Coordinates of N, CA and C and ligand atoms in Angstrom, one line a residue:
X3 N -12.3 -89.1 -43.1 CA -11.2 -88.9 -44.2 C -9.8 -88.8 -43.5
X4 N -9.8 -89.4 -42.2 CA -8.5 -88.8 -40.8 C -7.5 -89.7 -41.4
X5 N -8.0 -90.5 -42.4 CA -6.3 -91.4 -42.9 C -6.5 -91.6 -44.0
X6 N -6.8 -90.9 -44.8 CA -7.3 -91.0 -46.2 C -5.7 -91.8 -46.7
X7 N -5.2 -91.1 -46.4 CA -3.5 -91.5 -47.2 C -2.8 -92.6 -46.7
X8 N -3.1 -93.1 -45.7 CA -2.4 -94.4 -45.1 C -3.1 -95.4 -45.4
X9 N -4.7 -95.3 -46.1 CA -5.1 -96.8 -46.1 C -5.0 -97.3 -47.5
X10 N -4.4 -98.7 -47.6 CA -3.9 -99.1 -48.5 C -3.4 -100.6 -48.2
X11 N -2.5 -101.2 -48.9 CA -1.4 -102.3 -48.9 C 0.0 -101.8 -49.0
X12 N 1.0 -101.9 -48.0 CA 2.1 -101.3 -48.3 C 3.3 -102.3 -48.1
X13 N 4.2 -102.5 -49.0 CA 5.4 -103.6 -48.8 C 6.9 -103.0 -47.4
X14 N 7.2 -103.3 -46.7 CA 8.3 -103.1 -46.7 C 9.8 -103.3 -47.3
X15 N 10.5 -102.2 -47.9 CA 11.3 -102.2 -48.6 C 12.8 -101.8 -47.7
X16 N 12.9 -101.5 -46.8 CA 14.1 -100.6 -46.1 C 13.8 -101.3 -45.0
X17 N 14.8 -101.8 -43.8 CA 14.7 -101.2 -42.1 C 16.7 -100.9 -41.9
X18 N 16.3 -100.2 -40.8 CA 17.5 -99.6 -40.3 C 17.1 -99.5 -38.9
X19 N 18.4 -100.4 -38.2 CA 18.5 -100.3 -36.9 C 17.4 -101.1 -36.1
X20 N 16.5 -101.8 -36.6 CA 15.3 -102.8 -36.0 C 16.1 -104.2 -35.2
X21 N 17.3 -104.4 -35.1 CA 17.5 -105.1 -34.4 C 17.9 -104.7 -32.8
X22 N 18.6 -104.1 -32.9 CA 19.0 -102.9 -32.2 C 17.6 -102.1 -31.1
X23 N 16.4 -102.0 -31.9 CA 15.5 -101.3 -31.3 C 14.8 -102.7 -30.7
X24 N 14.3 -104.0 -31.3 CA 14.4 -105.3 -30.8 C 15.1 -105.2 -29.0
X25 N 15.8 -105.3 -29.5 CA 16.9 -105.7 -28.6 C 16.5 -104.7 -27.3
X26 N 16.7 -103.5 -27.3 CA 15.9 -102.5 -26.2 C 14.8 -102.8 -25.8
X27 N 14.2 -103.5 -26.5 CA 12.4 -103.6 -26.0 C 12.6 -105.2 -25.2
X28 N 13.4 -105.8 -25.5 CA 13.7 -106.7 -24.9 C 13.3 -108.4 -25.8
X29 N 13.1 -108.2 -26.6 CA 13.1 -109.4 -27.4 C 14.0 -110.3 -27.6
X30 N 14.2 -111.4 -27.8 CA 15.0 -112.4 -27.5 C 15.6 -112.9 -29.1
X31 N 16.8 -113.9 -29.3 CA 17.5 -113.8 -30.3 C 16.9 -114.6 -31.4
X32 N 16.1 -115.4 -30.9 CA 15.6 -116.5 -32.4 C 14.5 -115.5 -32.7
X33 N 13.8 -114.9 -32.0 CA 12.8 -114.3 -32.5 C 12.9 -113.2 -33.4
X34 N 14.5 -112.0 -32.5 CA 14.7 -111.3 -33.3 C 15.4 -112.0 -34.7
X35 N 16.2 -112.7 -35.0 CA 16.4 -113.3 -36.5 C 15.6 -113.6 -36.9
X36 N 14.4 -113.9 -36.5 CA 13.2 -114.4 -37.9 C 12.5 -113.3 -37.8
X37 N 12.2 -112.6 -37.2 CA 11.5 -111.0 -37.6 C 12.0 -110.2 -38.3
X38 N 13.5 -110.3 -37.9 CA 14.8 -109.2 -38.7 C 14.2 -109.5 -40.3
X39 N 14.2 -111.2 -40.3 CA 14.1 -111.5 -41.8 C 12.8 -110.9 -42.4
X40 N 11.7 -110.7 -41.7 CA 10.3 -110.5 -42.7 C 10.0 -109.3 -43.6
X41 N 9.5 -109.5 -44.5 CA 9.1 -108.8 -45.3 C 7.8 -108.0 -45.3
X42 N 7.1 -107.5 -44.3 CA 5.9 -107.9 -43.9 C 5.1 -107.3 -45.0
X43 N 3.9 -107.3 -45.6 CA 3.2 -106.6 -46.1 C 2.3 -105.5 -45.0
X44 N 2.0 -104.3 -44.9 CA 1.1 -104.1 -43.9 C -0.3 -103.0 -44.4
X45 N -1.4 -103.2 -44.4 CA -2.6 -103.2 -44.6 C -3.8 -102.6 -43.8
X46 N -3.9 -100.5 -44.3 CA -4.6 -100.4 -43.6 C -5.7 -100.0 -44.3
X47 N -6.8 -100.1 -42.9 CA -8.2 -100.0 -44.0 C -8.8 -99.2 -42.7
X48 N -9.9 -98.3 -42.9 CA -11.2 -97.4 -42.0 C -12.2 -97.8 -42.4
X49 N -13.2 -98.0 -41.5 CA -14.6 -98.1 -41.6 C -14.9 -97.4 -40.3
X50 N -15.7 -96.0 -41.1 CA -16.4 -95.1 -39.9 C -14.8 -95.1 -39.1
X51 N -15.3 -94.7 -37.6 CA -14.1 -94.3 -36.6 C -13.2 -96.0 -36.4
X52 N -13.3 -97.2 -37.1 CA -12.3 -97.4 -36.8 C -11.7 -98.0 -37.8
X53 N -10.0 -98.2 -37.2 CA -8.7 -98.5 -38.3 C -8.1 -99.8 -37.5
X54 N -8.4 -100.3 -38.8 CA -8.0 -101.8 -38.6 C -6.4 -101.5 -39.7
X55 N -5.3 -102.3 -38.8 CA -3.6 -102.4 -39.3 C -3.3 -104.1 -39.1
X56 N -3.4 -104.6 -40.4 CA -2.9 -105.2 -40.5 C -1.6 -105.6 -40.6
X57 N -0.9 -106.4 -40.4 CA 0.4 -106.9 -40.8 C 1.0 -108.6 -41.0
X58 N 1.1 -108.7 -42.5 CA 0.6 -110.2 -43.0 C 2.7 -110.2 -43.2
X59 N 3.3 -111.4 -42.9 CA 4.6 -111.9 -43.4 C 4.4 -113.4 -42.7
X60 N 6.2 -113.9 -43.3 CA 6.1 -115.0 -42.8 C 6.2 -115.3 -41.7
X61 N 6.7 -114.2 -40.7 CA 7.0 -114.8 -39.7 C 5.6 -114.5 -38.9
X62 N 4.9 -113.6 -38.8 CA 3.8 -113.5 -38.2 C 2.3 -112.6 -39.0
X63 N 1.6 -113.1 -38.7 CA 0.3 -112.2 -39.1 C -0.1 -111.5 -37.9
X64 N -0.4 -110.2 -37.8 CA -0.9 -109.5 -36.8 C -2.5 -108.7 -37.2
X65 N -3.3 -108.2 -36.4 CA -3.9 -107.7 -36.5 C -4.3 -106.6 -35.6
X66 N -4.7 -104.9 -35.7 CA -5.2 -104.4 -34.8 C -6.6 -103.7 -35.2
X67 N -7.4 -103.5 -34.5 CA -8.9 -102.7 -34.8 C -8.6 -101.4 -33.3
X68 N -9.1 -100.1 -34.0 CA -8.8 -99.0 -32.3 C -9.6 -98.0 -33.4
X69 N -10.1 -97.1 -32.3 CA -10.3 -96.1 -32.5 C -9.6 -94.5 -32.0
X70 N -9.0 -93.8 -32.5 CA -8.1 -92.6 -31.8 C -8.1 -92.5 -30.9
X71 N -7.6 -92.4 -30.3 CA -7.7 -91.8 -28.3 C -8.2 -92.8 -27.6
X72 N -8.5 -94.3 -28.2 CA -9.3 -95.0 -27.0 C -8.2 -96.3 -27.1
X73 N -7.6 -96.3 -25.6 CA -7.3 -97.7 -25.4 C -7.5 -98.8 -25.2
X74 N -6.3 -99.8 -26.0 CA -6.7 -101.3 -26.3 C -5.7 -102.0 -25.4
X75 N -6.2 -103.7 -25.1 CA -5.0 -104.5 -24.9 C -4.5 -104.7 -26.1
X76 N -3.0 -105.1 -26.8 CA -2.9 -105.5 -27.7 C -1.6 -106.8 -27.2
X77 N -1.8 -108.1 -27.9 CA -0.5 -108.9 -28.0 C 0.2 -108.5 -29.0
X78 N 1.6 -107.8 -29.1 CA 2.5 -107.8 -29.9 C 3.3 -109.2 -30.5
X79 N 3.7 -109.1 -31.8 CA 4.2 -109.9 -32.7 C 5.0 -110.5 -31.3
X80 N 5.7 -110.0 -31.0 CA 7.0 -110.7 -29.8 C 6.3 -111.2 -28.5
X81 N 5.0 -111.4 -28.9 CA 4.4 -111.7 -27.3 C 4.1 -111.0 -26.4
X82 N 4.4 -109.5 -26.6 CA 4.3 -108.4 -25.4 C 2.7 -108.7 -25.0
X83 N 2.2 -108.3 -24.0 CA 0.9 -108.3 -23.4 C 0.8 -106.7 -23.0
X84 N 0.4 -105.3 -24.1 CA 0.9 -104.5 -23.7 C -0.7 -103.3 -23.7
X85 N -0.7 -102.4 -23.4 CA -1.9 -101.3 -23.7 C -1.5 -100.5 -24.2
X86 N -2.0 -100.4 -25.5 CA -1.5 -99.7 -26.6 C -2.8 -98.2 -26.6
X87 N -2.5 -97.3 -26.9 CA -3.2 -95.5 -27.5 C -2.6 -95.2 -28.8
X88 N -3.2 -95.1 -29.7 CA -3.1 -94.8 -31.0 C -4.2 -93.2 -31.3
X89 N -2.9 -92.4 -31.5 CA -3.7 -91.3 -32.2 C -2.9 -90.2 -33.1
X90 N -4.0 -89.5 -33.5 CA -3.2 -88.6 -34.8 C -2.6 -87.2 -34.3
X91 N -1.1 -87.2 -34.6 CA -0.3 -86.1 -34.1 C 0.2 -85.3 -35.2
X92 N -0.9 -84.4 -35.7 CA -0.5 -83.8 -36.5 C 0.3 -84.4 -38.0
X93 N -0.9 -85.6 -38.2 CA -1.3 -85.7 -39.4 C 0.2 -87.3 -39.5
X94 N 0.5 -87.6 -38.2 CA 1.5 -89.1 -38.0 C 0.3 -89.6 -37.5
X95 N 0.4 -90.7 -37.1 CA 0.0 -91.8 -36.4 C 0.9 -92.1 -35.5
X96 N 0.4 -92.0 -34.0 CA 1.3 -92.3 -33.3 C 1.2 -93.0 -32.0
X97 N 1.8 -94.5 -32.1 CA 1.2 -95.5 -31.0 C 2.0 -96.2 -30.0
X98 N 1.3 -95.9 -28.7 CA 2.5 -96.0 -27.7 C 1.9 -96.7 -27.1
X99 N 3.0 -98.0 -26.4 CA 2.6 -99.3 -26.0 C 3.2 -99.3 -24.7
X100 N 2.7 -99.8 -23.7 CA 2.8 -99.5 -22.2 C 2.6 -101.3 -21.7
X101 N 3.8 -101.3 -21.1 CA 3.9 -102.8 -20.4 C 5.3 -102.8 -19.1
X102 N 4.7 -103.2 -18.1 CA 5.9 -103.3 -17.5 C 6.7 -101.9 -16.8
X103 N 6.1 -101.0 -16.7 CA 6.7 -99.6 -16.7 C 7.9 -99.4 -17.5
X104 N 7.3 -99.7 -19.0 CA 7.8 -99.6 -19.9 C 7.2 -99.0 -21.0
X105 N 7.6 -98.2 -21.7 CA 6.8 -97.7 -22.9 C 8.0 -97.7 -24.5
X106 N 6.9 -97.5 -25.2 CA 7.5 -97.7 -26.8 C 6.7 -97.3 -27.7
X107 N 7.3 -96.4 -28.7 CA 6.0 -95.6 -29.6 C 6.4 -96.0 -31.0
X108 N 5.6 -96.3 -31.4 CA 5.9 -96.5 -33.0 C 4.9 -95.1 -33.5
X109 N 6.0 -94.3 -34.5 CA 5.3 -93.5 -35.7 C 5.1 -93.8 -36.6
X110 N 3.8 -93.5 -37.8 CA 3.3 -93.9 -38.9 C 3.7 -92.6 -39.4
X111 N 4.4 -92.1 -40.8 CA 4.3 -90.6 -41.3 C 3.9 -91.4 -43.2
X112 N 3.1 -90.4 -43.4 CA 3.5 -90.7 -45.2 C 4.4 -89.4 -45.7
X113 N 5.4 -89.8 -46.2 CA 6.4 -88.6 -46.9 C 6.4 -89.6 -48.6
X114 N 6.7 -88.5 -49.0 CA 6.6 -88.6 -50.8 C 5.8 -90.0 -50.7
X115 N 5.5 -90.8 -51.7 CA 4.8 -92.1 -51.8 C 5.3 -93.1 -51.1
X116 N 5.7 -92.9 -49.8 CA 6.3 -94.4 -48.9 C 5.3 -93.7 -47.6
X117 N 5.2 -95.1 -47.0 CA 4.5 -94.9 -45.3 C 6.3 -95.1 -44.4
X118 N 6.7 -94.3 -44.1 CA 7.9 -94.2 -43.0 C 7.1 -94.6 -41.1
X119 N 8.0 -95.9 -40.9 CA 7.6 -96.6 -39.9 C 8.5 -96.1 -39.1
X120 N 8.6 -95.1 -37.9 CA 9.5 -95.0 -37.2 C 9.5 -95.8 -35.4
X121 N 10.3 -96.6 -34.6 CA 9.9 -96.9 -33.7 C 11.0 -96.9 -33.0
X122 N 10.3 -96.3 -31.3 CA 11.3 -96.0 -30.4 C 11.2 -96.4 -29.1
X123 N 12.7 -97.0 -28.8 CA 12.5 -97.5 -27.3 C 13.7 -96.4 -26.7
X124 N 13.4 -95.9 -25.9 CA 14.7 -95.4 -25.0 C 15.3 -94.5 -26.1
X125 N 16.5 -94.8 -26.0 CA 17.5 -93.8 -26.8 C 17.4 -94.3 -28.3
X126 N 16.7 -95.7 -28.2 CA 16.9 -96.3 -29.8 C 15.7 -96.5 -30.4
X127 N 16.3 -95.7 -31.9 CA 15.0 -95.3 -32.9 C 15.5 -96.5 -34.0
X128 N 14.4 -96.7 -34.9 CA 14.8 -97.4 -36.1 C 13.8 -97.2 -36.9
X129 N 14.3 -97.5 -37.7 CA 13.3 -96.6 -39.2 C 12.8 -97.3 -40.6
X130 N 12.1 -97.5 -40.5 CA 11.5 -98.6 -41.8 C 10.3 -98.0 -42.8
X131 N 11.0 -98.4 -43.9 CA 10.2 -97.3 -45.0 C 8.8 -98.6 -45.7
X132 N 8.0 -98.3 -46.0 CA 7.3 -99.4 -46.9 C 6.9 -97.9 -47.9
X133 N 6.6 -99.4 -48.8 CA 6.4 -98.4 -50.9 C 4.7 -99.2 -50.9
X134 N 4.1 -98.8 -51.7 CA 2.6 -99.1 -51.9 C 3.3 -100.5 -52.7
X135 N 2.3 -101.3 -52.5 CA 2.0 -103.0 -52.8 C 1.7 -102.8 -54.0
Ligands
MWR201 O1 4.1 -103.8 -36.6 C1 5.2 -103.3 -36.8 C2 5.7 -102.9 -38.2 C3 7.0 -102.4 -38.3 O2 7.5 -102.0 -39.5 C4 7.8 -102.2 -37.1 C5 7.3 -102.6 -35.9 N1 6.1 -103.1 -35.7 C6 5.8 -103.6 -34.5 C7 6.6 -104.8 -34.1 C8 6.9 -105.2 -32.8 C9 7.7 -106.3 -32.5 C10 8.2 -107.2 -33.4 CL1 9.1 -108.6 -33.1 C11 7.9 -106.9 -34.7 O3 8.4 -107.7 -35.7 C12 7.7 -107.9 -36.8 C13 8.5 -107.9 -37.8 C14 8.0 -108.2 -39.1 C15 6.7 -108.6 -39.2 C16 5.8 -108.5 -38.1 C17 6.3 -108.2 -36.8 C18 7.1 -105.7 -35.1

């Protein structure tokens, strides 16, 4: 029941400062404009210990399957080749991606009826809200 509240279909409706956090992680400009643009839907589901996060738009479909505390390779939307740990901090989701002696965490929170996407590189945060589908 560790994500009772997060699994679902959720739209993105808000981002703030995603180019900007882009840009710190090192992503390049045609890619950041067509991601800037997506709308993504994103889609999570549990079975037993593990959580599969989808993320379906136009610009990319992604997928991940993990179980808490155990690390994965993951290819990120931008091509990163990175090893990602996903676990629950006190009721967020919180997943940190390690490439390059580099790192980047994206937070999952649910507050009132939105899933709040928070992700951080260095000094730059950016914040993206999705509403249930
Ligand atoms: O998977 C998520 C969901 C978020 O809201 C924020 C970051 N990340 C991770 C993430 C990492 C890099 C890029 Cl380029 C990215 O761009 C998109 C944009 C839209 C659709 C798919 C990938 C999303």
């Amino acid at each position: 029941h560790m994500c009772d509240a997060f699994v679902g279909t959720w739209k993105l409706v808000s981002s703030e400062n995603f180019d900007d956090y882009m840009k710190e992680v090192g992503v390049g400009f045609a890619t950041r404009k067509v991601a800037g643009m997506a709308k993504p839907n994103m889609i999570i589901s549990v079975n037993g210990d593990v959580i599969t996060i989808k993320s379906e738009s136009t610009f990319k479909n992604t997928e991940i399957s993990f179980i808490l505390g155990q690390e994965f390779d993951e290819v990120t939307a931008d091509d990163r080749k990175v090893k990602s740990t996903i676990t629950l901090d006190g009721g967020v989701l919180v997943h940190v991606q390690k490439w390059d002696g580099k790192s980047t965490t994206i937070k999952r929170k649910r507050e009132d009826d939105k899933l709040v996407v928070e992700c951080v590189m260095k000094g730059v945060t950016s914040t993206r809200v999705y509403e249930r589908a």
